Coordinates of C-alpha atoms in Angstrom, one line a residue:
Chain T
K55 CA 117.9 100.0 151.8
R56 CA 116.8 98.7 148.4
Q57 CA 116.3 94.9 148.5
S58 CA 117.0 92.5 145.6
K59 CA 115.8 94.0 142.3
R60 CA 114.1 91.8 139.7
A61 CA 115.6 91.4 136.2
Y62 CA 113.4 92.2 133.2
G63 CA 113.5 93.0 129.5
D64 CA 111.7 92.4 126.2
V65 CA 111.3 89.4 124.0
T66 CA 110.1 88.9 120.4
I67 CA 107.4 86.4 119.5
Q68 CA 107.5 85.0 116.0
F69 CA 104.5 83.4 114.3
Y70 CA 104.5 80.8 111.5
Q71 CA 102.1 83.0 109.5
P72 CA 100.6 86.4 109.9
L73 CA 97.7 86.2 112.4
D74 CA 94.0 85.4 111.7
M75 CA 92.2 86.6 114.9
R76 CA 92.8 89.1 117.8
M77 CA 94.7 86.5 119.8
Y78 CA 95.8 87.1 123.4
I79 CA 98.6 86.4 125.9
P80 CA 97.6 86.4 129.6
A81 CA 99.8 87.9 132.3
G82 CA 102.0 85.3 134.1
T83 CA 102.9 83.3 130.9
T84 CA 106.2 81.5 131.4
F85 CA 109.3 81.8 129.3
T86 CA 112.3 79.5 129.7
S87 CA 115.7 79.2 128.1
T88 CA 116.5 75.8 126.6
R89 CA 120.2 76.3 127.4
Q90 CA 121.3 74.2 130.4
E91 CA 123.7 76.9 131.6
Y92 CA 120.8 79.4 132.2
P93 CA 117.9 77.4 133.7
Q94 CA 116.3 80.5 135.1
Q95 CA 112.6 81.2 134.2
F96 CA 110.8 84.4 133.3
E97 CA 107.1 85.5 133.5
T98 CA 105.0 88.3 132.2
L99 CA 103.0 90.8 134.4
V100 CA 100.6 92.6 132.1
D101 CA 98.4 91.1 129.3
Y102 CA 98.8 91.7 125.6
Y103 CA 96.5 91.3 122.6
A104 CA 98.2 90.6 119.2
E105 CA 96.5 92.6 116.5
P106 CA 94.9 90.6 113.6
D107 CA 97.1 90.2 110.5
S108 CA 100.2 91.1 112.6
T109 CA 103.4 89.0 112.4
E110 CA 105.5 89.9 115.4
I111 CA 105.0 91.4 118.9
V112 CA 107.2 92.7 121.7
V113 CA 106.3 91.9 125.3
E114 CA 108.0 92.5 128.6
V115 CA 109.1 89.5 130.8
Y116 CA 110.1 89.7 134.4
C117 CA 112.5 87.2 136.0
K118 CA 111.3 85.3 139.1
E119 CA 114.8 84.9 140.4
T120 CA 116.6 88.1 141.5
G121 CA 120.3 88.7 141.4
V122 CA 123.1 88.0 138.9
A123 CA 121.4 85.0 137.3
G124 CA 118.8 87.2 135.5
Chain G
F43 CA 110.8 134.8 61.1
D44 CA 110.5 134.1 57.3
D45 CA 109.2 137.7 56.8
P46 CA 110.6 140.1 59.5
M47 CA 107.7 141.8 61.2
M48 CA 108.0 145.6 61.3
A49 CA 106.8 146.5 64.9
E50 CA 105.5 150.1 65.0
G51 CA 106.4 152.3 67.9
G52 CA 104.2 152.5 71.1
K53 CA 101.7 149.8 70.2
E54 CA 101.6 146.8 72.6
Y55 CA 101.5 143.8 70.4
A56 CA 101.7 140.4 72.2
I57 CA 104.0 137.5 71.6
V58 CA 101.4 134.7 71.4
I59 CA 102.9 131.3 72.0
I60 CA 100.8 128.6 70.4
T61 CA 101.9 125.2 71.7
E62 CA 100.4 121.8 72.3
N63 CA 102.8 121.1 75.2
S64 CA 103.7 122.0 78.8
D65 CA 107.2 120.3 78.7
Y66 CA 108.4 123.4 76.9
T67 CA 109.1 125.6 80.0
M68 CA 110.4 129.2 79.3
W69 CA 111.8 131.9 81.8
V70 CA 110.3 135.2 82.9
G71 CA 110.7 137.8 85.7
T72 CA 108.3 139.0 88.5
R73 CA 109.0 141.6 91.3
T74 CA 111.6 140.0 93.6
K75 CA 111.4 136.2 93.6
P76 CA 114.7 135.8 91.6
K77 CA 115.2 132.9 89.0
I78 CA 111.8 131.3 88.3
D79 CA 109.1 130.6 91.0
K80 CA 111.6 129.8 94.0
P81 CA 114.6 132.1 95.2
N82 CA 114.0 135.5 96.7
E83 CA 117.4 137.1 97.7
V84 CA 118.9 139.9 95.5
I85 CA 119.4 137.8 92.3
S86 CA 116.7 139.5 90.0
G87 CA 113.3 141.2 89.8
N88 CA 110.8 142.2 87.0
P89 CA 112.3 142.9 83.4
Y90 CA 109.5 144.5 81.5
Chain L
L251 CA 121.2 105.7 104.2
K252 CA 123.1 103.2 106.2
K253 CA 120.1 101.3 104.6
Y254 CA 122.2 101.5 101.4
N255 CA 124.8 99.3 103.2
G256 CA 127.4 102.1 102.6
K257 CA 126.9 102.3 98.8
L258 CA 126.8 106.1 98.1
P259 CA 124.2 107.2 95.5
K260 CA 125.1 109.2 92.4
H261 CA 128.0 111.6 92.1
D262 CA 126.7 114.9 90.6
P263 CA 128.3 117.7 88.6
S264 CA 125.0 119.6 88.0
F265 CA 122.4 119.2 90.9
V266 CA 120.7 122.3 92.5
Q267 CA 119.3 122.8 96.0
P268 CA 116.7 125.5 97.0
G269 CA 119.2 126.2 99.9
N270 CA 121.1 128.6 97.6
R271 CA 121.4 132.0 99.4
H272 CA 125.2 132.8 98.8
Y273 CA 127.5 132.7 95.7
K274 CA 126.9 129.4 93.7
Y275 CA 130.6 128.8 93.3
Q276 CA 131.9 128.7 96.9
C277 CA 133.6 125.5 98.4
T278 CA 130.8 125.8 101.0
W279 CA 128.2 125.9 98.1
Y280 CA 129.5 122.7 96.5
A281 CA 129.3 121.4 100.0
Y282 CA 125.6 122.2 100.8
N283 CA 124.6 121.1 97.2
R284 CA 126.5 117.7 97.2
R285 CA 125.1 117.1 100.7
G286 CA 121.8 117.1 98.7
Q287 CA 123.0 114.0 96.8
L288 CA 122.5 112.5 100.3
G289 CA 119.2 114.4 100.5
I290 CA 120.2 116.3 103.7
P291 CA 120.3 120.1 103.2
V292 CA 121.5 122.7 105.8
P293 CA 120.9 126.4 106.5
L294 CA 123.7 128.4 104.9
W295 CA 126.8 129.9 106.4
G296 CA 129.4 131.5 104.0
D297 CA 132.3 130.8 106.5
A298 CA 132.9 127.1 106.9
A299 CA 133.9 127.7 110.6
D300 CA 130.4 129.1 111.2
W301 CA 128.9 125.7 110.4
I302 CA 130.2 124.3 113.7
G303 CA 128.3 126.9 115.9
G304 CA 125.4 126.9 113.3
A305 CA 125.2 123.0 113.7
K306 CA 124.8 123.5 117.5
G307 CA 122.0 126.1 116.9
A308 CA 120.3 124.1 114.1
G309 CA 120.1 121.0 116.4
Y310 CA 122.8 118.7 114.9
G311 CA 125.5 116.5 116.5
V312 CA 129.2 117.4 116.2
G313 CA 132.6 115.7 116.8
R314 CA 135.4 113.9 114.9
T315 CA 133.6 110.7 113.8
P316 CA 133.8 109.6 110.1
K317 CA 130.7 108.4 108.2
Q318 CA 130.3 107.9 104.5
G319 CA 129.7 111.1 102.5
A320 CA 129.2 113.4 105.5
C321 CA 131.1 116.7 105.5
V322 CA 134.4 117.4 107.0
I323 CA 135.0 121.0 108.2
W324 CA 138.4 122.5 108.6
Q325 CA 138.1 125.3 111.1
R326 CA 139.7 128.6 109.9
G327 CA 143.5 128.8 110.0
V328 CA 144.7 125.2 110.7
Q329 CA 146.8 122.6 108.7
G330 CA 144.3 121.7 105.9
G331 CA 142.1 124.9 105.7
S332 CA 142.7 128.7 105.0
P333 CA 142.1 131.4 107.6
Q334 CA 139.8 133.7 105.5
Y335 CA 136.6 131.6 105.2
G336 CA 137.4 128.0 106.3
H337 CA 137.4 124.9 104.0
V338 CA 135.3 121.7 103.5
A339 CA 135.1 118.3 101.8
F340 CA 132.5 115.5 101.1
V341 CA 133.8 112.1 102.1
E342 CA 132.9 109.5 99.4
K343 CA 134.5 106.4 101.2
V344 CA 136.0 105.7 104.6
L345 CA 139.2 103.7 104.2
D346 CA 140.7 101.2 106.7
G347 CA 137.7 101.9 109.1
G348 CA 139.1 105.2 110.3
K349 CA 142.7 106.2 109.5
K350 CA 142.3 107.2 105.9
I351 CA 139.3 109.0 104.3
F352 CA 138.6 109.6 100.6
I353 CA 137.2 113.0 99.8
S354 CA 135.7 114.9 96.9
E355 CA 134.2 118.3 95.9
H356 CA 137.1 119.7 97.7
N357 CA 138.5 123.3 97.4
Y358 CA 141.8 123.7 99.3
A359 CA 143.6 126.0 96.9
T360 CA 141.9 124.4 93.9
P361 CA 140.7 126.7 91.2
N362 CA 137.2 125.4 90.6
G363 CA 137.2 123.0 93.6
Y364 CA 136.2 119.8 91.7
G365 CA 138.8 117.2 92.7
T366 CA 139.6 114.3 95.1
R367 CA 142.1 113.5 97.8
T368 CA 143.0 110.9 100.5
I369 CA 143.3 112.4 104.0
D370 CA 145.3 110.8 106.8
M371 CA 143.3 111.1 110.0
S372 CA 146.6 109.8 111.5
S373 CA 148.2 113.2 110.8
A374 CA 147.4 116.9 111.3
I375 CA 145.2 117.4 108.3
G376 CA 142.5 114.8 109.4
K377 CA 143.0 115.4 113.1
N378 CA 142.2 119.2 112.7
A379 CA 139.0 118.6 110.8
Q380 CA 135.4 118.2 112.3
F381 CA 132.3 116.2 111.4
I382 CA 128.7 117.1 111.9
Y383 CA 126.3 114.2 112.6
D384 CA 123.0 115.1 110.9
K385 CA 119.6 114.8 112.5
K386 CA 116.4 112.9 111.2
Chain W
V168 CA 99.5 76.9 104.6
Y169 CA 96.8 74.9 102.6
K170 CA 98.9 75.5 99.5
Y171 CA 101.8 73.5 100.8
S172 CA 100.3 71.3 103.6
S173 CA 97.7 69.8 101.3
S174 CA 100.0 67.7 99.1
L175 CA 99.4 63.9 98.5
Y176 CA 103.1 63.4 97.7
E177 CA 103.9 59.8 96.9
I178 CA 107.0 58.1 95.4
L179 CA 106.7 54.7 93.7
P180 CA 109.4 52.0 94.1
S181 CA 110.7 53.5 90.8
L182 CA 112.2 56.9 91.6
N183 CA 109.6 58.5 89.3
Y184 CA 107.0 60.0 91.6
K185 CA 103.3 61.0 91.6
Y186 CA 102.1 64.3 93.1
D187 CA 98.8 65.9 93.9
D188 CA 97.9 69.1 95.7
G189 CA 94.9 71.0 97.1
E190 CA 95.6 73.6 94.4
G191 CA 95.3 72.8 90.7
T192 CA 98.8 71.7 90.3
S193 CA 99.3 67.9 89.7
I194 CA 102.4 66.3 88.5
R195 CA 103.2 62.7 87.4
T196 CA 106.6 61.3 86.2
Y197 CA 107.7 58.3 84.2
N198 CA 111.0 56.8 83.0
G199 CA 113.7 59.3 82.1
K200 CA 112.8 63.0 82.4
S201 CA 109.4 62.4 80.9
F202 CA 106.5 63.7 82.9
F203 CA 102.8 64.7 82.8
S204 CA 101.6 67.9 84.5
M205 CA 98.5 70.1 84.8
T206 CA 97.7 73.5 86.4
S207 CA 95.4 76.5 86.1
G208 CA 96.9 79.4 87.9
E209 CA 98.8 81.9 85.6
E210 CA 101.5 82.1 88.4
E211 CA 102.0 78.4 88.0
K212 CA 101.9 78.5 84.2
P213 CA 105.6 77.7 83.8
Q214 CA 105.2 74.3 85.6
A215 CA 103.0 73.0 82.7
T216 CA 103.9 75.1 79.7
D217 CA 105.2 74.1 76.2
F218 CA 106.8 77.3 75.1
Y219 CA 109.9 76.8 72.9
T220 CA 111.3 73.4 74.3
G221 CA 108.9 73.2 77.2
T222 CA 109.6 73.3 80.9
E223 CA 112.6 71.4 82.2
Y224 CA 112.3 68.6 84.8
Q225 CA 114.6 70.6 87.1
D226 CA 112.2 73.6 87.0
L227 CA 109.6 71.7 89.0
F228 CA 110.1 72.1 92.7
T229 CA 108.4 68.8 93.4
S230 CA 111.3 67.0 91.6
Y231 CA 113.6 67.6 94.6
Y232 CA 114.1 65.7 97.9
Chain C
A138 CA 131.7 148.7 69.6
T139 CA 135.1 147.2 68.8
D140 CA 135.0 144.1 71.1
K141 CA 138.6 145.0 72.0
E142 CA 137.1 147.7 74.3
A143 CA 136.1 144.7 76.4
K144 CA 138.8 142.1 75.5
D145 CA 141.7 144.5 76.2
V146 CA 140.4 144.6 79.9
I147 CA 139.1 141.1 80.0
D148 CA 142.8 140.6 79.5
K149 CA 143.2 142.2 83.0
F150 CA 140.5 139.8 84.1
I151 CA 142.7 137.0 82.6
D152 CA 146.0 138.1 84.2
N153 CA 144.2 138.8 87.5
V154 CA 142.6 135.3 87.6
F155 CA 143.8 132.7 85.0
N156 CA 147.5 133.5 85.4
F157 CA 149.6 133.5 88.6
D158 CA 153.2 133.3 87.5
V159 CA 154.6 132.5 91.0
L160 CA 151.7 132.9 93.4
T161 CA 151.7 134.9 96.8
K162 CA 149.9 137.7 98.7
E163 CA 152.0 140.2 96.7
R164 CA 150.8 138.9 93.3
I165 CA 147.3 138.7 94.8
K166 CA 147.3 142.4 96.0
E167 CA 147.6 143.9 92.5
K168 CA 145.5 141.1 90.9
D169 CA 142.7 142.4 93.3
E170 CA 143.0 146.2 92.8
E171 CA 143.3 145.9 89.0
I172 CA 139.8 144.2 89.1
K173 CA 138.2 146.9 91.3
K174 CA 138.4 149.3 88.3
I175 CA 136.4 146.9 86.0
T176 CA 134.2 144.5 87.9
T177 CA 130.7 145.4 88.9
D178 CA 133.0 145.9 91.9
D179 CA 131.0 144.2 94.6
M180 CA 132.0 141.3 92.4
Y181 CA 135.7 141.6 93.2
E182 CA 134.9 139.9 96.5
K183 CA 133.0 137.3 94.4
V184 CA 136.5 136.8 92.8
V185 CA 138.3 136.6 96.2
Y186 CA 136.0 133.6 96.9
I187 CA 138.0 131.5 94.3
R188 CA 141.5 132.2 95.6
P189 CA 144.7 129.8 96.0
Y190 CA 145.8 128.6 99.4
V191 CA 149.6 129.0 99.2
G192 CA 151.8 126.2 100.5
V193 CA 149.3 124.0 98.9
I194 CA 149.1 126.1 95.7
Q195 CA 151.4 127.8 93.3
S196 CA 151.0 129.2 89.7
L197 CA 147.9 128.5 87.7
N198 CA 148.5 129.6 84.1
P199 CA 146.3 130.5 81.0
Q200 CA 148.1 128.7 78.1
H201 CA 146.1 128.1 74.9
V202 CA 144.4 131.6 75.5
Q203 CA 141.5 130.7 73.1
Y204 CA 138.3 132.8 72.8
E205 CA 135.3 132.8 70.5
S206 CA 131.7 134.3 70.1
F207 CA 130.0 137.5 71.2
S208 CA 126.5 139.1 71.3
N209 CA 126.0 142.8 71.9
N210 CA 123.0 145.0 72.7
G211 CA 125.0 147.8 71.0
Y212 CA 127.3 148.8 74.0
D213 CA 126.5 146.1 76.7
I214 CA 128.0 142.8 75.7
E215 CA 128.0 139.0 76.4
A216 CA 131.1 137.0 75.3
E217 CA 132.3 133.3 75.5
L218 CA 136.1 132.8 75.9
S219 CA 137.5 129.3 76.2
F220 CA 140.7 130.3 78.0
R221 CA 142.4 126.9 78.7
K222 CA 144.6 126.1 81.8
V223 CA 148.0 124.7 82.6
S224 CA 149.0 124.5 86.3
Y225 CA 152.0 123.5 88.4
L226 CA 151.1 123.9 92.0
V227 CA 153.9 123.3 94.6
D228 CA 154.3 119.5 95.1
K229 CA 151.1 119.2 92.8
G230 CA 154.0 119.3 90.4
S231 CA 155.2 115.7 91.3
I232 CA 152.1 115.4 89.1
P233 CA 150.8 118.8 87.7
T234 CA 147.1 119.9 87.3
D235 CA 145.3 120.7 84.0
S236 CA 142.0 122.2 82.8
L237 CA 139.7 122.8 79.9
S238 CA 137.9 126.2 80.5
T239 CA 134.8 128.1 79.2
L240 CA 133.7 131.6 80.4
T241 CA 130.6 133.5 79.3
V242 CA 131.5 136.9 80.7
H243 CA 129.0 139.8 80.5
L244 CA 129.9 143.5 80.5
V245 CA 128.2 147.0 80.5
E246 CA 129.1 150.5 79.5
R247 CA 128.3 153.3 82.0
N248 CA 129.7 156.9 81.7
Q249 CA 132.1 155.4 79.0
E250 CA 133.6 153.4 81.9
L251 CA 133.4 149.6 81.6
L252 CA 132.1 147.0 84.2
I253 CA 132.1 143.2 84.2
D254 CA 128.9 141.5 85.3
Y255 CA 128.6 137.8 85.0
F256 CA 131.4 136.3 87.0
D257 CA 131.8 133.0 85.2
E258 CA 134.1 130.0 84.7
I259 CA 133.0 126.5 84.0
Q260 CA 136.2 124.6 84.9
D261 CA 136.2 121.5 82.7
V262 CA 137.8 118.2 83.5
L263 CA 139.6 115.4 81.6
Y264 CA 142.1 114.4 84.4
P265 CA 130.5 96.0 98.2
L266 CA 130.7 93.7 95.2
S267 CA 127.1 92.5 94.8
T268 CA 125.6 95.8 95.8
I269 CA 127.9 97.7 93.4
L270 CA 126.7 95.6 90.5
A271 CA 123.1 96.2 91.6
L272 CA 123.6 100.0 91.8
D273 CA 125.3 100.0 88.3
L274 CA 122.2 98.2 86.9
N275 CA 119.9 100.7 88.7
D276 CA 121.8 103.6 87.2
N277 CA 121.7 102.1 83.7
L278 CA 118.2 100.7 84.0
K279 CA 116.6 103.4 81.9
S280 CA 119.2 102.9 79.0
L281 CA 118.6 99.1 78.9
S282 CA 115.3 99.3 77.0
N283 CA 116.7 97.1 74.2
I284 CA 116.5 94.1 76.5
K285 CA 113.1 92.3 76.2
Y286 CA 111.3 89.8 78.3
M287 CA 110.8 86.1 77.4
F288 CA 110.1 82.9 79.4
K289 CA 113.5 81.2 78.8
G290 CA 115.4 83.6 76.6
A291 CA 119.0 82.2 76.4
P292 CA 120.6 84.3 73.6
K293 CA 124.2 83.8 72.6
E294 CA 124.9 87.5 72.2
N295 CA 125.7 89.7 75.2
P296 CA 123.0 92.4 75.7
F297 CA 125.4 95.1 76.9
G298 CA 127.8 94.6 74.0
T299 CA 125.1 95.2 71.3
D300 CA 122.7 98.0 70.4
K301 CA 120.3 95.3 68.9
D302 CA 117.3 94.2 70.9
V303 CA 117.4 90.8 72.5
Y304 CA 115.1 88.7 74.6
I305 CA 116.6 87.7 78.0
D306 CA 115.0 86.4 81.2
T307 CA 116.1 87.1 84.8
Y308 CA 118.5 84.2 85.2
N309 CA 120.3 84.9 81.9
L310 CA 120.3 88.7 82.9
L311 CA 122.1 87.8 86.2
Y312 CA 124.6 85.6 84.3
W313 CA 125.4 88.4 81.8
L314 CA 125.7 91.0 84.6
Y315 CA 128.1 88.9 86.6
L316 CA 130.0 87.7 83.5
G317 CA 131.1 91.3 82.8
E318 CA 133.6 91.1 85.7
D319 CA 136.3 88.6 86.8
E320 CA 133.6 86.0 87.7
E321 CA 132.0 83.5 85.2
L322 CA 129.4 81.3 86.9
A323 CA 127.8 78.5 84.7
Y324 CA 125.2 78.8 81.9
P325 CA 122.1 78.8 81.6
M326 CA 122.0 79.1 85.4
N327 CA 118.6 77.5 85.7
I328 CA 117.3 77.1 89.3
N329 CA 119.8 74.3 90.0
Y330 CA 122.9 76.5 90.2
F331 CA 121.8 78.2 93.4
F332 CA 122.0 74.8 95.2
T333 CA 124.7 72.7 93.7
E334 CA 127.1 75.5 92.5
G335 CA 127.9 76.8 96.0
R336 CA 128.2 80.6 95.4
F337 CA 125.3 81.3 97.7
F338 CA 124.3 80.9 101.4
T339 CA 120.7 81.3 102.3
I340 CA 119.6 84.3 104.4
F341 CA 115.9 83.4 104.9
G342 CA 114.2 80.1 104.2
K343 CA 111.1 79.4 102.2
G344 CA 107.7 79.0 103.8
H345 CA 107.6 82.0 106.1
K346 CA 106.8 85.5 105.1
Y347 CA 107.4 88.5 107.4
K348 CA 106.8 92.1 106.3
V349 CA 108.7 93.7 109.2
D350 CA 112.0 91.9 108.5
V351 CA 112.2 93.3 104.9
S352 CA 113.9 96.4 106.1
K353 CA 116.9 94.4 107.3
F354 CA 117.7 93.3 103.7
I355 CA 120.5 94.8 101.6
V356 CA 120.8 96.0 98.0
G357 CA 121.7 93.1 95.6
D358 CA 120.0 90.3 97.6
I359 CA 118.4 87.8 95.2
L360 CA 114.6 87.7 95.6
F361 CA 112.7 84.7 94.4
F362 CA 109.1 84.6 93.1
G363 CA 106.5 82.0 92.3
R364 CA 105.5 78.7 94.0
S365 CA 107.9 76.7 91.9
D366 CA 110.7 79.2 91.6
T367 CA 109.3 80.6 88.3
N368 CA 111.1 83.9 88.4
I369 CA 113.7 85.7 90.5
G370 CA 114.7 89.3 91.1
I371 CA 117.4 91.6 92.6
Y372 CA 116.6 93.7 95.6
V373 CA 117.2 97.5 95.6
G374 CA 116.6 99.9 98.5
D375 CA 113.5 101.9 99.4
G376 CA 111.4 98.7 99.3
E377 CA 111.7 97.9 95.5
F378 CA 113.1 95.2 93.3
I379 CA 114.3 94.9 89.7
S380 CA 112.8 92.2 87.5
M381 CA 110.9 91.6 84.2
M382 CA 107.1 91.2 84.4
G383 CA 104.7 90.6 81.5
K384 CA 102.4 88.2 79.9
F385 CA 103.8 84.7 79.4
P386 CA 103.9 84.3 75.5
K387 CA 107.0 86.5 74.8
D388 CA 105.9 89.9 76.1
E389 CA 107.4 93.0 74.4
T390 CA 107.6 94.8 77.7
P391 CA 111.2 95.9 78.5
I392 CA 113.0 95.5 81.8
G393 CA 111.6 97.7 84.6
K394 CA 111.4 98.3 88.3
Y395 CA 108.2 97.7 90.3
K396 CA 107.2 98.4 93.9
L397 CA 107.3 95.4 96.3
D398 CA 103.8 96.1 97.8
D399 CA 101.8 94.4 95.1
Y400 CA 104.3 91.6 94.5
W401 CA 104.8 90.9 98.2
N402 CA 102.1 88.2 98.1
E403 CA 104.2 86.1 95.7
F404 CA 107.6 86.5 97.4
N405 CA 107.8 83.0 99.0
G406 CA 110.4 84.2 101.7
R407 CA 113.5 82.7 100.0
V408 CA 116.5 85.0 100.0
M409 CA 120.1 84.3 99.0
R410 CA 123.5 86.2 98.9
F411 CA 126.8 86.1 97.0
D412 CA 130.3 85.2 98.3
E413 CA 133.4 85.4 96.1
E414 CA 136.4 85.5 98.5
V415 CA 136.4 81.9 99.7
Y416 CA 135.1 80.2 96.5
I417 CA 138.0 78.3 94.8

C-alpha cells in the first residue's frame, strides 16, 4: 500500500531589482508561511541558478509534513 | 490623349508607363493565379 | 485577445482575407472574413453545418460556450437557421454573462446580411446554435 | 537603487527643506513656494526649467512627504 | 445596341431578386427559372445563395427603381443601376427594413441570346469605460495630427472641437479626453490630482520594475514616466503606449505611438486606474 504522500508545488521569488550576477539557491532551502493558521514548513530538493538580469524565478518546494496539512 | 494616336494594324506598340512612384499599383492577368498575385481557383487567367 | 480585456477591435465593411475560395457574398463568407478582424482565419466550407465536422478535422474545440466575437453556427434546419446551407453570426458582445448575446454580420433571411440582433440563449434560437473554440 | 538611496534629504525647523542626491539633481526651498534647483539630465530638465511660467513647486517629487 | 436589350431582361433580374410581393417557395420557383434563361446560368445558384428564410422573411421590394450609366464594348455591356429597396418582412414590420442599393451588372451577347455575368449588389445602409476611451483615441490617433506637443500647454480651446492646431501636453490631453463624456475632473490636472482627487487606485507602486508583469496590464492603464513624474501616458495592447515625445522647447512633433521597449528604462513602475461608479 502507498504510504503518506508528500505535498509539493511551485513558488515565485520576487527580487527588488533585476539581478546582477548568476546567483544560486541550494537544495534544502526552507520556506515558511507567516500565517499562524498554517505553520507548516516547506523545503526544496534540487538546486536552481537564477540567470543574470532576470527578475523572477519559479522553483519547486516539497512539504516536510505529509497529510492534509500540506 | 490630347492628340488621339492612330494605331496601325498588326504592329505591337507598347504602352510605356513612365512614373516616379510605386504607390501607383495597377492590375494585370497571368495564366491561372486569379485577381493579382494571390488567388488561384477559377476566378480569372491571362487576358492578352 | 482576452489581452484586449474584452474590447473588440475594429468593425469592418471592407476587409479581405486570402481564405477566399467560395462566393464572396455568402453568410459564411462574411463570417470567415470578419473572423479575420480577430485575426483568426479558417479553411472554407460553403455549408455552415460542415464547419462543425471541419472544426474537428482542423483541430479546433467545439461546444456551446460564448466568447466575445467568436462565431455561432446554426446547424442546418433548426430554429434560427435554414436547411439548405446552414447559417452563422459573429458575436460582438456577450450580455448578462451568458443568457443574451449581441450578434452582427448576420444573414438569416437578410438580403445582403449586414445587420445586428440580440439572441436569447435562454430560448430555442441560442440553444440550437454551436460555438467553435479556436486554436493558437 | 543609487538614484533613490543616495539622497541627503533634510528638512529644517522651517518646513522649507534642503535636498541633495547622488545624481545631479539638487533642490533648496525658502519661504512661500520659492525654491532653488539645479540638474543636468535632459530627463530631469522639467525639475529646473523656466519655460513659460517655470516649473511649479508641486511638480517636484521631493516636495511631498 | 439599344440598352433596352439588356434592361428589358435586367427587369427579369429585378423582379426575380429585388421584388418579392409576398414571399414563398412558389414565388421563388419562377423567380429561379426566369433567371436560368439569362444568367451565365451557373450563376443562378450564385443567386440562390442570397435567398430569404421564410417565417423570418417576407416581401423585399424595389421601390425608387433608379438606374444610371453604361459602358459597352459594342455588344457586351457593363451597367450601374441604383435600384433602391423598401422591405416589410413578417414581424420585421413592427419596424420595417430599408436599403440604398447599387448594382454594376455585366452582360454578354452570344448567338443573339443574352447572358448576365457580374452578379452584383452593394447593399447600402442608413438604418469598459476607460478602455473604450483609449480604443477611440487609438482609432482616431492618425487624424489628430493638429494637436502639437509642449511642456505645459494648457489651451482654453478644446482640440477635438477645432480644426486649428493647438499645443497640448499629456495631462491636458487626458483632461480633454475625459471631458467629452459625462465626467469632468479638475483642470489643469497637474500631478496633484492623482493623489488628492481620489478617482484612482494604484495598481503597482513606484520603485520596482518588472518586465514579466507588463503582460498583466490592461488597455487604458495610465503609465507614468520620469524620475519626478515629468510625463505620463496611456497604455495600449501589444506592448505599446500613447504619449507625446519630443525636444523640450516646444517641439513641433505631433502626437504619436511608440514601442515600450526603448522607453521601458524610464517607466518608474507607477501604474494607476480609473473608477467612476462609486465616486460621488
